[PDB]
Design a protein around this ligand. Structure first.
Ligand code: TDC
Ligand code: TDC
Ligand code: MG
Ligand code: MG
Lengths: 173, 173
């Protein structure tokens, strides 16, 4: 794995300088006797990607009380907030692929949706599509804010698009 | 506005170095007697954002032969390809807001969907949501590729999520 004290420090610096200004040399200048090394920046951002979810993605895993709508909705809501908790959250996540630990739990997501009446390809599609929508929505929210140096709510807009998405999936539950 | 020879040169350099390596000083080192200036990088990326669409967003505007499904579908397909034509296309677009010229044509999109049976808030939601989904989908495609230094198709995956999206909107045409 890799130490928490180090990850916390990188997250906090990320809030200061965003992804573009975040480097491992600057990470060390923040910290200065337990050893750490990242294979490269991308590796740092993969770790932060994972950390963001560990800390905030709270209806990631299913629960007896869930039904399919309530899980995907909550799941999307919860993903989104993990992305929004940190500067450049969405950008960082892009192109990441869920890990070995994230795989076991990501297999639970499926075996629930199949349980509930979706086909295999439909279930992958429900997760990806929600995923693509969310990253998209957050990216636009985060950049619009981030770029302001040069109407009714990004939460509404998200919440709506997600409502539409859940309907079109219901057409094959 | 701002000169085409200059924009072409910036697009071509963008393909070489992505957004992170693109700066106005490097743009000039590419060119070196007609004058140009960008207020800042963000302004450069706003112009490139617009150029990408001017060049490739081909079922942006409606047409008598369109119906609503075929327009939103095509529209999304066409947007997406504009984003994919250039490195970091999606990232660049994030946070941009369609211009004065893009406004007149963006008003045509609506007055078509309202024409076809969507309410006002539904029509905004259809465009945004497709928009958020697309930027999301492309961002993940572009980064996954971009980051490779450290199953069945991103076109399928997009095409599917877009299919689901169009269904959930049909629930209020
Ligand atoms: C299934 C899947 C997912 C994600 C993902 O990136 C991904 C991928 O890049 C390739 C193949 C499959 C997936 C998510 O990012 C993620 O957000 C995620 O990792 C995830 C998670 N770790 O809990 C989720 O809950 C999912 N939710 C947004 C639908 C989604 C699931
Ligand atoms: C309506 C709207 C749109 C976009 C957009 O960014 C935006 C916004 O940032 C704030 C408020 C409204 C909009 C698009 O990016 C854009 O891609 C776009 O500019 C656009 C265009 N210029 O033709 C489109 O066709 C749209 N399509 C993806 C649904 C969508 C329309
Ligand atoms: Mg991911
Ligand atoms: Mg835009």
């Amino acid at each position: 794995l890799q130490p928490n004290t180090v990850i916390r420090a990188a997250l906090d610096l990320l809030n200061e300088v965003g992804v573009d200004g975040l480097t491992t040399r600057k990470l060390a200048e923040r910290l200065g006797a337990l050893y750490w090394h990242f294979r490269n920046k991308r590796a740092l951002l993969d770790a932060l990607a994972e950390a963001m979810l560990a800390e905030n993605h709270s209806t990631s895993v299913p629960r007896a009380d869930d039904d399919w709508r309530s899980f995907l909705t909550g799941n999307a809501r919860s993903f989104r907030q993990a992305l929004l908790a940190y500067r450049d959250g969405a950008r960082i996540h892009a192109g990441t692929r869920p890990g070995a630990p994230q795989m076991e739990t990501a297999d639970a997501q499926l075996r629930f949706l199949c349980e509930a009446g979706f086909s295999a390809g439909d279930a992958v599609n429900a997760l990806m599509t929600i995923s693509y929508f969310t990253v998209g929505a957050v990216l636009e929210e985060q950049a619009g804010d981030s770029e302001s140096g040069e109407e009714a709510g990004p939460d509404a807009a998200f919440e709506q698009g997600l409502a539409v998405i859940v309907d079109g999936l219901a057409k094959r539950r």
